[PDB]
Scaffold this active site. Sequence first.
Site, PDB file in Angstrom:
ATOM      1  N   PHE A   1      64.554  50.687  41.128  1.00  9.21           N
ATOM      2  CA  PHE A   1      64.679  51.259  39.759  1.00  9.21           C
ATOM      3  C   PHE A   1      63.876  52.563  39.636  1.00  9.21           C
ATOM      4  CE2 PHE A   1      63.898  46.488  38.849  1.00  9.21           C
ATOM      5  CZ  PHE A   1      65.112  46.119  39.381  1.00  9.21           C
TER       6      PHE A   1
ATOM      7  N   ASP B   1      71.840  55.409  37.788  1.00  9.54           N
ATOM      8  CA  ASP B   1      71.696  54.077  38.442  1.00  9.54           C
ATOM      9  C   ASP B   1      71.833  52.932  37.425  1.00  9.54           C
ATOM     10  OD1 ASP B   1      69.204  54.050  37.145  1.00  9.54           O
ATOM     11  OD2 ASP B   1      68.063  54.443  38.985  1.00  9.54           O
TER      12      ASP B   1
ATOM     13  N   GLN C   1      69.445  51.467  35.640  1.00  5.99           N
ATOM     14  CA  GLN C   1      68.316  50.513  35.825  1.00  5.99           C
ATOM     15  C   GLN C   1      66.975  51.242  35.682  1.00  5.99           C
ATOM     16  OE1 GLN C   1      67.735  46.372  37.239  1.00  5.99           O
ATOM     17  NE2 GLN C   1      67.513  47.601  35.387  1.00  5.99           N
TER      18      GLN C   1
ATOM     19  N   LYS D   1      29.743  36.084  54.616  1.00  2.00           N
ATOM     20  CA  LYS D   1      28.343  36.204  54.121  1.00  2.00           C
ATOM     21  C   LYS D   1      27.540  34.975  54.560  1.00  2.00           C
ATOM     22  CE  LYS D   1      28.820  38.937  49.794  1.00  2.00           C
ATOM     23  NZ  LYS D   1      27.817  39.952  50.194  1.00  2.00           N
TER      24      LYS D   1
ATOM     25  N   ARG E   1      19.256  41.040  53.857  1.00  2.00           N
ATOM     26  CA  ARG E   1      19.517  42.204  52.967  1.00  2.00           C
ATOM     27  C   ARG E   1      18.696  43.395  53.456  1.00  2.00           C
ATOM     28  NH1 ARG E   1      23.719  43.006  48.954  1.00  2.00           N
ATOM     29  NH2 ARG E   1      24.758  40.978  49.119  1.00  2.00           N
TER      30      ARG E   1
ATOM     31  N   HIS F   1      22.947  36.396  47.643  1.00  2.00           N
ATOM     32  CA  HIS F   1      23.922  36.053  48.714  1.00  2.00           C
ATOM     33  C   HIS F   1      23.810  37.058  49.862  1.00  2.00           C
ATOM     34  CE1 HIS F   1      26.518  38.181  45.569  1.00  2.00           C
ATOM     35  NE2 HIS F   1      26.534  39.025  46.606  1.00  2.00           N
TER      36      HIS F   1
ATOM     37  N   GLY G   1      30.856  42.106  48.558  1.00  2.06           N
ATOM     38  CA  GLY G   1      31.692  41.712  47.408  1.00  2.06           C
ATOM     39  C   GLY G   1      32.428  42.904  46.823  1.00  2.06           C
ATOM     40  N   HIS G   2      31.717  44.017  46.614  1.00  2.00           N
ATOM     41  CA  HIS G   2      32.261  45.293  46.074  1.00  2.00           C
ATOM     42  C   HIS G   2      33.268  45.900  47.060  1.00  2.00           C
ATOM     43  CE1 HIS G   2      28.828  45.368  43.088  1.00  2.00           C
ATOM     44  NE2 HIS G   2      29.890  45.687  42.340  1.00  2.00           N
TER      45      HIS G   2
ATOM     46  N   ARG H   1      26.519  50.782  46.416  1.00  3.94           N
ATOM     47  CA  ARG H   1      25.566  49.681  46.720  1.00  3.94           C
ATOM     48  C   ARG H   1      24.523  50.181  47.729  1.00  3.94           C
ATOM     49  NH1 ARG H   1      25.465  46.071  42.726  1.00  3.94           N
ATOM     50  NH2 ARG H   1      24.869  44.342  44.097  1.00  3.94           N
TER      51      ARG H   1
END
Lengths: 632, 632, 632
Positions: free
Chosen positions: A387, A394, A396, A421, A429, A506, A512-513, A581
């Site tokens: 589409f 077309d 659509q 992790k 860390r 953690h 995580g990011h 981070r």
Amino acid sequence: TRRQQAQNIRNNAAELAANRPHPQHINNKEEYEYRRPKKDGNEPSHIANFTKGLPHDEHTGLLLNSADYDQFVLGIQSGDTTDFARTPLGPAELPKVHGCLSKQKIDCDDDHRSGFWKSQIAQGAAGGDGAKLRAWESAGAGLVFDLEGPDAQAVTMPPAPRLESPELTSEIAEVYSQALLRDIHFSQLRDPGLGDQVNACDSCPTQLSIYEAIDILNTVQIEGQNWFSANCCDLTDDEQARQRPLVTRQNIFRGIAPGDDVGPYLSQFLLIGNNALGGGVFGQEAGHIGYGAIRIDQRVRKATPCKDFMTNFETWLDVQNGADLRGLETYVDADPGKCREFPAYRVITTPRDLATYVHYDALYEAYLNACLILLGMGAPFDPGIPFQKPDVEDKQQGGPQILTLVCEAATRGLKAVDFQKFNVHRRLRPEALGGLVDRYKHGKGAGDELKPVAALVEALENVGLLSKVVAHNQLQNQNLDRSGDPSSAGDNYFLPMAFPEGSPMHPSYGAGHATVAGACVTMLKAFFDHGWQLNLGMANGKYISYEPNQDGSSLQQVLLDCPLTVEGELNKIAANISIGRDWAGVHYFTDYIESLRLGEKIAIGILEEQKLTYGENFTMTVPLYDGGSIQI
Amino acid sequence: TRRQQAQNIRNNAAELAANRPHPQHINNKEEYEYRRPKKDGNEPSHIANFTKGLPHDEHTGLLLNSADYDQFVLGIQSGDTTDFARTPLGPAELPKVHGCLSKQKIDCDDDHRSGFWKSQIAQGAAGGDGAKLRAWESAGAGLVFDLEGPDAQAVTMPPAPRLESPELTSEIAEVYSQALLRDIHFSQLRDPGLGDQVNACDSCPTQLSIYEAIDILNTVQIEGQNWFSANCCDLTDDEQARQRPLVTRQNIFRGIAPGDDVGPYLSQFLLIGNNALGGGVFGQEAGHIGYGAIRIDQRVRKATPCKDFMTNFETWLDVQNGADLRGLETYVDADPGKCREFPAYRVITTPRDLATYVHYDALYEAYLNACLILLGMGAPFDPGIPFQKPDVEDKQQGGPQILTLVCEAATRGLKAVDFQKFNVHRRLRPEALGGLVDRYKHGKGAGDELKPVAALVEALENVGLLSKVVAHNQLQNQNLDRSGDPSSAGDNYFLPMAFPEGSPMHPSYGAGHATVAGACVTMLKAFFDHGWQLNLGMANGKYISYEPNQDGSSLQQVLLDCPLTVEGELNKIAANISIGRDWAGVHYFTDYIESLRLGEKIAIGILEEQKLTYGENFTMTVPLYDGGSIQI
Amino acid sequence: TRRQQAQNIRNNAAELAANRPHPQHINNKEEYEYRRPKKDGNEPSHIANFTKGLPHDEHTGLLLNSADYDQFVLGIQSGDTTDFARTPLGPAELPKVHGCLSKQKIDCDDDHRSGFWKSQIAQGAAGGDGAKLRAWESAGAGLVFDLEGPDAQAVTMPPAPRLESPELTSEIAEVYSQALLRDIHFSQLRDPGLGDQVNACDSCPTQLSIYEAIDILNTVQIEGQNWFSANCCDLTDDEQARQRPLVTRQNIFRGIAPGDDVGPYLSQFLLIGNNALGGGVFGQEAGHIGYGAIRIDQRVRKATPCKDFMTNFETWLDVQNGADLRGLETYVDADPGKCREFPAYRVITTPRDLATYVHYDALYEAYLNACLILLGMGAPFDPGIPFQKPDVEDKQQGGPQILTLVCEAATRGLKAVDFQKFNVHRRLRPEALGGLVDRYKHGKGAGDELKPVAALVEALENVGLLSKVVAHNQLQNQNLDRSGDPSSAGDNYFLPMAFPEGSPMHPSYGAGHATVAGACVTMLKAFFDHGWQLNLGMANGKYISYEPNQDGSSLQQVLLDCPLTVEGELNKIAANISIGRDWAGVHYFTDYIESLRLGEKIAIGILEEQKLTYGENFTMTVPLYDGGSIQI
């Protein structure tokens, strides 16, 4: 019928994910390798593992007892709620019998907890009552399956570097430098040939400049070998893939992703907004995203400059002893005269402002906002999609499906890494390593416990980085909040931290990011015409960009020979948050890249499973971070 | 192993959805019931079906040819891209042979399209070139399956009312009244006992007041029977469930959902924001949502008041002939003196501002924003969920999973309704009915084509609603943009439309907004402690709320005997957006409720399938719109 | 072969139960709806949930801490033995930190527990040592499957009424009245036209009569609406089904089951016995069931009249604090002169005697005994069954299969409801509500904690029921056992309780007695010729029945126009036991009916599964409580 077809397509999608090759998870074996002496024996010291929350000896700063760590793992491995509840948390006393579990100082019966904490901040944190004890986050999140996307253990990310390796030394040195350049203006982090560079309006005592920092990373070496200088032959196939070139003014602290080097450091999507709805009352330089009929302000809360935390032993120890210090940082108050709550809120001027952005960053916020900006601009979708083109021809005519998909991907991301992790790598860390460095220079630990770190610190001392960090910390300790702490005049080598609690509860390896970043951006590049050149404007022939003012009141334009692409900026915003981070000092570089590389695999996997639901039989072309693009 | 368990949980979730009872889809049979005369025969007129985009006779305004509609359906039913491309679109000429397909006037070869359009606006729309022809949206979206959630045809929504029924007459009359009360201040739509009521700062010629409108809905009747007055015995089990009580100042235009009646009309989540991050620089009354570190402005673009569209035949015809008029509406310019781009942008003061909000409303925008406000406030999650209460005691500690889930649900929603809109009900738009009314009063159509509408208009004329609408339209036609149109002095009965293109290019029954609303809010109520009393404040003993100013510069507080709940406001914001379409004149009431009731079934279905992935074996308590709450 | 057929029939029966529609369980959402104020927040008060056994504040009488209740649920939901063991039980002290779990006062180390209890009875219960602490019964019984019958979660029972509803007000008022009419003669509970009515031989101070009680239930109303008076339109499809007519002398406290209204209140099967074996030495009026060669005495242990418990705060609190007081009630001593241990044991004269019957009622005792009486009488089996009619003609000739089946059904019953009690509804006990009423009238609770109950008490006070209950309790408190309790002169509004421990340690909604009753009787009606007219006798043309004497020495005959049926009495005995709990004040009316309606579904389900084992291919006709009969 559809009732049959529906049950089948879902059953077929499950078999697809099951037929995908399942790799075997490998780690640096550091966990049980480095040892320390006990009575008539040697035990695993766990100095190179995540130990934040567990009992740390209040005089030494080392892991108080190994039996605590061994219980901590067993709760993860067994995946039992009961086993994990027996693991001791926070300040603890040693057992009278040897090899038994440490006795937790704090419990539910403690309304006042001021006595247990050694740092003045933590002692008067909870309005005088004393800081609370926070536990580990999303321990059993890695042991959850999903209806769409590959499984947590169906994908792995290659093993992390070691303390003895030259690769780490450059990574920790890079993180240290970023902490000293956290107040720097973002206009500095680019080749001066592109435009006029500015200095941060607020004059901050800097112990390190850019020019110096560039030398450090090229000079720093272990056994006469620099990470950037080392030829391919010496490195492994893993290290070869994540190897970087000689550090440049352009590429310093910038991710190895197509279009990261091109243009300024800061991605446009973290600054610009959409043109005002209907009759254009303002321009894109305003910083108002076209959130349908309402808007999104691109200005972020300004954290009062030159304010770092965990600079001395007492502050650091308490945090690594699970002291809950969230929201103890102070922010700049607003100016009554100026509009739009300035300076209280302002455009992302310095890495500090990016650290604040990612401190409370909503999972997909950075990548949802990016999707809205592109949608409001009127960016074309990858032609392969249905589409498209004219309405008349077309008969659509989607945004709805992509908008949900960037959010869908993030969830699957966290569960994939939360295994890596905890269950696999269990890496310390960067702030926790920052402590180890100081401890070795104070000559703490039993026998040759910190001998492994000895090789690391020498390179950092030999490049003269430690000398600056000690000098930098001295000035931070003259602050009234941590001045009373005994270690204030102790020449503390600890890596300065942006948040009072520093890193989350953690382990470091798998971000995580970054995992969410890699997955969410991959989805955006798949749908959008990845190449599409952003028509932000043109000034005096050369194409126009944007970056912040010295006070951060508006956007100073930068002029480039070639225009910026959707891919380049999507790869750059992915890097910004992930490295955002690294600026706060919570992730290494390798955490950014390998999480991101895993991120796209989770994302790709979903699209392949969701492909069966469509009977159109189209193709989606997804540009990868490692060169060429994959057809779905 | 997990590789086996992963494949199984996904296979088990597919069987769960397959084992769920599949209902059979029923419609009002109106489609092929109402007929008109052809040469030596009677054919289905399709006056009570969605016909927007198809060829409409340029003199009559009726469906030009049935063979076009019969082809249009066959493309939906066959689900073939080829078949749907043969269906004629826009202005057309009738065939020389009888029963053959209409010849499309416009094609790719037309760069200038001004000649084909009869309305001055459409003729000079595309910068003088002439308006473009838009096609039907998401025709094959209902024929797509999903990996999570129940299937599109696995759930249905009970059949829509008829033209002859008394229920519809109240619904169309309610929509008409809302168009005349579109400039009303939101403080009017509530019992005056709660606080002081205000009038909109901009003085607009009003043909209808609230007091009058309340009488209309209670008085309006078919065969001496009012929708609200009719006892249970007379109504069917479907009508019994969606029956409303006698219209009150409090409950007028308010959805039948727990907590809708309680407090003001406008939900707090569409006004308030989160407290400024860190040191509180402003309060919640500011209207800044805590979008992590950045914010979201709750102010919406102000559409220049007293400006309605499709008021005459020429404008209406062209839109129903698929004339693309998106973004032709004008908005108020900003005041240089005032901050925060006011009045250009302002707080949602009048229903117009809600219509503008929902005009470009991002799918989940209203419900994502609601989730952020609750998260920033620190609202508790439904206690049944894991890792709740103290950190110390349990040694465990989500927002990430709910944030993705509200977006997940929306996607599944659209595919469920897109079947109901097209494949099942194929109901005309309220604006398209607005035309039918005018056509009957102009005595157009062949023989007894519009005889079905005759019963409807008499009730609307007998309550004296039509008289006002004709008077209201007269004033709108004195505008220079549509003054040149021949029908300007023709006493046009057409329902005034908020957007120049009015309704979208997809049938009325099943609401895209309402289906997403029902699903997204259901997810939020499941996770959050639905009962939780919002601690917005307390003033002079009674609990405090908010609603806009007469100029919309700030929030005027309202004081309630009992405090507002999370559920009540979540149900109210769900109603606001869904009814927000009814204000613009694009959906009936029944479109709001039945889509919403279907919305929660799609949502509930996902949670039941995703339940297998968790080994914790917890329960989630979900409060339903129809009384009691369901345990998951 | 049979080895194959055996494995198959069992596999086929499992698929049958799996193919049966599985409903979704819904509750009144009251659990987390009604809230109370904590420090800077509102929490779920759980005033409308079962909380018996958990820590209750010893001054207020409310739930001491919510965190206890939230843990209590998690143990049920997780189905973990460990989690449920952490939940605090009995008198407790509040935690020093907020949100943590309450500290249990009692443990294994306490040999003397007199100090913890506030009531004189509980303090000197365990022969001076002090009452023991009892735990929750059959918590994990709802999480057990069966080889025959439908699964616990394969069947549900529609949601329970609310405190704000008018339905509950009539139910609690009905239960209160029964407590005041607990010493009434059973001859009173019927239309006086049937025969001469008598008064209980023991003269008891009555604060309420029948005539008064009938007015209360018809007069009592919430928002000017009586439960019996309200027309169908106002009520829901659930409430419509369980709605009762205007209370009559005949139908007062009688279940809505075919044949309940017909004849006296007390079913014949709870009074009469079988004719003496062989040569008839006595008649059926004797009360000796034909237990093969031996017999069963129909006389029950007489509890010393006018003796109620839990009348004051101290007694009530201690019970709701899980004080084990079982078997502390006193019974009447025997008369040496009279035979058959009278009055110590006697025929069921007053509702008290029924409460004693059901206090230690063996699961199926009432329904086994009923089966024996019918078998001894020579009652015909439903003709559809094999080996019936003459022995000579058919050459074939069961009681054994039905006798086991009534016991089989009971087991399946308990597991079905034990889920509903705990996992789904978690409804408070009537005695626990009895407390709430008193607490509101003493003005206890924090802020608007008991505001929900405010509407309830007013109706009870406005009908003048509370006034009697306070007066009734005053006389009970003059007893030496609870006279020493401080609240004796405090005008206690608590619902008087029949057993010293009152209700058992499991939630109200779903009745153990009623669920077993519905299932066991359904089985009996299936096998027996449900219609069969009991040939108990005929006196002066009209058919003869039985009911007790004023002293309960024999059976006084009652004469009816039409004879009593097997169905009618089987439905009546089912009602007697279920309502027998309502008389003791442990169940509402709705607990009786919905458990019973669920009871027959469990029973029916077994017969359908056991149908495959028989190759005869017969049919069983089962008369339902809701009108017509089902063919199996």
